[PDB]
Design an enzyme around this catalytic site. Sequence first.
Site, PDB file in Angstrom:
ATOM      1  N   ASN A  49     -13.909  29.082  26.053  1.00 28.03           N
ATOM      2  CA  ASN A  49     -12.939  28.117  26.580  1.00 28.03           C
ATOM      3  C   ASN A  49     -13.466  26.697  26.344  1.00 28.03           C
ATOM      4  OD1 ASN A  49     -11.393  30.221  27.688  1.00 28.03           O
ATOM      5  ND2 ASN A  49     -12.733  30.365  29.407  1.00 28.03           N
TER       6      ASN A  49
ATOM      7  N   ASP B  28     -16.710  19.777  26.075  1.00 25.32           N
ATOM      8  CA  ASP B  28     -17.209  20.928  26.854  1.00 25.32           C
ATOM      9  C   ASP B  28     -17.373  22.099  25.981  1.00 25.32           C
ATOM     10  OD1 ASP B  28     -17.840  22.983  28.659  1.00 25.32           O
ATOM     11  OD2 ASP B  28     -15.964  22.615  29.853  1.00 25.32           O
ATOM     12  N   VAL B  29     -18.638  22.469  25.679  1.00 24.83           N
ATOM     13  CA  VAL B  29     -18.864  23.540  24.712  1.00 24.83           C
ATOM     14  C   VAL B  29     -18.746  24.924  25.388  1.00 24.83           C
ATOM     15  CG1 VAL B  29     -20.296  22.007  23.327  1.00 24.83           C
ATOM     16  CG2 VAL B  29     -21.438  23.512  24.875  1.00 24.83           C
ATOM     17  N   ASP B  30     -18.680  24.919  26.700  1.00 29.35           N
ATOM     18  CA  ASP B  30     -18.491  26.168  27.519  1.00 29.35           C
ATOM     19  C   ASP B  30     -19.629  27.111  27.217  1.00 29.35           C
ATOM     20  OD1 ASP B  30     -17.236  27.833  29.353  1.00 29.35           O
ATOM     21  OD2 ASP B  30     -16.129  28.938  27.710  1.00 29.35           O
ATOM     22  N   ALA B  31     -20.875  26.589  27.277  1.00 27.91           N
ATOM     23  CA  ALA B  31     -21.989  27.340  26.768  1.00 27.91           C
ATOM     24  C   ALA B  31     -22.255  28.618  27.554  1.00 27.91           C
ATOM     25  CB  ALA B  31     -23.256  26.571  26.820  1.00 27.91           C
TER      26      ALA B  31
END
Length: 636
Positions: free
Chosen positions: A460, A451-454
């Site tokens: 995060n 999860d790159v938390d774009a």
Amino acid sequence: SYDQAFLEQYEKIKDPASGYFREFNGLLVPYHSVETMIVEAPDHGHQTTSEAFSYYLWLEAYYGRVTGDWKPLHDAWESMETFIIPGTKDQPTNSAYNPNSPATYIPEQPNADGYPSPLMNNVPVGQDPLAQELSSTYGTNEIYGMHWLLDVDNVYGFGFCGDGTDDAPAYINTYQRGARESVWETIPHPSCDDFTHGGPNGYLDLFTDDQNYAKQWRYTNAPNADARAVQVMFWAHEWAKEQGKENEIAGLMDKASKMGDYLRYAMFDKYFKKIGNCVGATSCPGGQGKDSAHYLLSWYYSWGGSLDSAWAWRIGSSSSHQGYQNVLAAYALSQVPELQPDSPTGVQDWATSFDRQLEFLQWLQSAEGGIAGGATNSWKGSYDTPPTGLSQFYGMYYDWQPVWNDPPSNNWFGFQVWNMERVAQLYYVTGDARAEAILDKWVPWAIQHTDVDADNGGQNFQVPSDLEWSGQPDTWTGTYTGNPNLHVQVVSYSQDVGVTAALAKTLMYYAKRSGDTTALATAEGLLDALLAHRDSIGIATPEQPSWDRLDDPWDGSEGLYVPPGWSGTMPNGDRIEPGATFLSIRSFYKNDPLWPQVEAHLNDPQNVPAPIVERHRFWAQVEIATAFAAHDELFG
Ligand SMILES: OC[C@H]1O[C@@H](O[C@H]2[C@H](O)[C@@H](O)[C@H](O[C@H]3[C@H](O)[C@@H](O)[C@H](O[C@H]4[C@H](O)[C@@H](O)[C@H](O[C@H]5[C@H](O)[C@@H](O)[C@H](O[C@H]6[C@H](O)[C@@H](O)[C@H](O)O[C@@H]6CO)O[C@@H]5CO)O[C@@H]4CO)O[C@@H]3CO)O[C@@H]2CO)[C@H](O)[C@@H](O)[C@@H]1O
Ligand SMILES: OC[C@H]1O[C@@H](O[C@H]2[C@H](O)[C@@H](O)[C@@H](O)O[C@@H]2CO)[C@H](O)[C@@H](O)[C@@H]1O
Ligand SMILES: [Ca+2]
Ligand SMILES: [Ca+2]
Ligand SMILES: [Ca+2]
Ligand SMILES: [Ca+2]
Ligand SMILES: [Fe+3]
Ligand SMILES: [Fe+3]
Ligand SMILES: [Fe+3]
Ligand SMILES: [Fe+3]
Ligand code: NA
Ligand code: NA
Ligand code: NA
Ligand SMILES: [Zn+2]
Ligand SMILES: [Zn+2]
Ligand SMILES: [Zn+2]
Ligand SMILES: [Zn+2]
Ligand SMILES: [Zn+2]
Ligand SMILES: [Zn+2]
Ligand SMILES: [Zn+2]
Ligand SMILES: [Zn+2]
Ligand SMILES: [Zn+2]
Ligand SMILES: [Zn+2]
Ligand SMILES: [Zn+2]
Ligand SMILES: [Zn+2]
Ligand SMILES: [Zn+2]
Ligand SMILES: [Zn+2]
Ligand SMILES: [Zn+2]
Ligand SMILES: [Zn+2]
Ligand SMILES: [Zn+2]
Ligand SMILES: [Zn+2]
Ligand SMILES: [Zn+2]
């Protein structure tokens, strides 16, 4: 640019104020980490490792790429030769070695309470087919390979063969007592034991049960690290050649090929037994020639000798882990003239290994796509009987947790990316269809758990951390079944920046060659995430380690074992005796700046949480730098 990001991170790592290194007479020795209180593989931050040195090479090779200045890479190689490849003083009696009788068998025991473990002369040991050839090739009986672990600041007090001096990093070792001996359960000791410290026979009789004890040295290679050092030099070649400077590093290429020649010791059974269905230590025959080669990068090789009627010995190792394999190094050593070993059979051995490592990695590929643990020619490290029906690879037995069982050695997601990045790099270089097949199944799996938390700039982000394995591959018959009965699930996630950078690279190399747009998008999100966590000395994210084993005595299965009746002291006077703890034989830890917070948590763990720290591991900080540099190498 990311080349600006590379240089920024590089500068942090190399700025003395950051504290990544200790300087000895103009040469730099990296620490494991900037922070001192860290217990995971080394057990002190200012130990260091052959791993760290391989990463130091990697950082300076990218510096050469970016600037055309190859002298820092030379410096790093000089430092390695000076401080961690044992010199003649450190390994002085190899002339006594007899390759026809390489070692005496000692069985590994199931727990630390089995040690000291006895010599068994009735167990056949094979012939070592490398030694005489290496001596004839290099004109010395010495081993050109890194030892795995140094004490850079002499925190333990060993010095040089027990002298207690701090003029050079000390050669030390920890793991000795089999699969169940974790980082928390070792008794650190000098590699060169003249009995200055420890008990009356130094530390030797905690480990080996012999009727006589002699002063002696011994070293252990970390093949994951020496193979990485070779891989770095493949790249230095490539990058210097593009500059028309390939000649500035031709000596370093020679020396990497020499390292690779000796690294063949990792390809052999521990006691040079013939490979395959090697069950029963007295029954499994000694090897002849190369029939004791498994042709994989095993967990170690080791060598030692008397300090002094001299005797000397060498061992390979029988168990191999997917995370160690290095198909890029194997390709280089087998097919790049600049890296091909000079020994008459070195190249052939590496060409066999290149092939064998790719088959091994494919055999281990789970239903979901992650790469399972490995295999061994010596069950439980005593040529024991494995369960009926256990999977095999070239007559070796599937091991879901090679070597370490505290913790199971393949539960860390880091080994997935360390191996996979090298597979991706091969695929980038040559398009290798075998590499491509592994990657096409692994890459989606990894992406699916990242999860790159774009939408939030990577604040995060999360990458896989802990893995739980089940089942087994199908026995290998030279074809991939899809291993529907071998499974992995991700059970924890982290912000581990080292793992992050290796994942980002893996994805970038794969994307470059394949054109895969999802892979590149993930990688780009990971690099943004890294940039979002810059601090004054590197890039770091919160972690919360556990400390509850530091005060645990032996309880009959876990904790620090010492033999009944054994007594000795560490260099600082700490008592090694039954009822000791990790901390009690490392009492210097109570002066560490993190110590009060650790103890305050252990004093009241319901109400005082464990400290949250932002650590700067050398290898991880380099991993990051190399990810930034790779981005511009691959994408401009
Ligand atoms: O015959 C002439 C005289 O013989 C004398 O007896 C000698 C005998 O000749 C000789 O063969 C025998 O040699 C044994 C050594 O005494 C013994 O210490 C050595 O033990 C090995 C052990 O087999 C091996 O499993 C152990 O591996 C460790 C390794 O040390 C450690 O560094 C490594 O750690 C890795 C970490 O796990 C990992 O996280 C990290 O990344 O990398 C690390 C490095 O790879 O872990 C591994 C596995 O746990 O190493 C030790 C050595 O340290 O075994 C020798 C062969 O059996 O010594 C005898 C003396 O007792 C007679 O005494 C005389 O009468 C004769 O005349
Ligand atoms: O033993 C393999 C590598 O472990 C690295 O430490 C890991 C640790 O095992 C994880 O539990 C978690 O703590 O992350 C650490 C940092 O990634 C260690 O730093 C390396 O030296 C080992 O080769
Ligand atoms: Ca001494
Ligand atoms: Ca244990
Ligand atoms: Ca494909
Ligand atoms: Ca405890
Ligand atoms: Fe001393
Ligand atoms: Fe050469
Ligand atoms: Fe048994
Ligand atoms: Fe899932
Ligand atoms: Na040079
Ligand atoms: Na040479
Ligand atoms: Na970006
Ligand atoms: Zn600076
Ligand atoms: Zn120059
Ligand atoms: Zn030079
Ligand atoms: Zn040199
Ligand atoms: Zn210091
Ligand atoms: Zn070339
Ligand atoms: Zn060339
Ligand atoms: Zn093949
Ligand atoms: Zn954050
Ligand atoms: Zn777990
Ligand atoms: Zn086939
Ligand atoms: Zn980009
Ligand atoms: Zn942050
Ligand atoms: Zn921050
Ligand atoms: Zn932070
Ligand atoms: Zn934060
Ligand atoms: Zn905790
Ligand atoms: Zn806790
Ligand atoms: Zn705790």
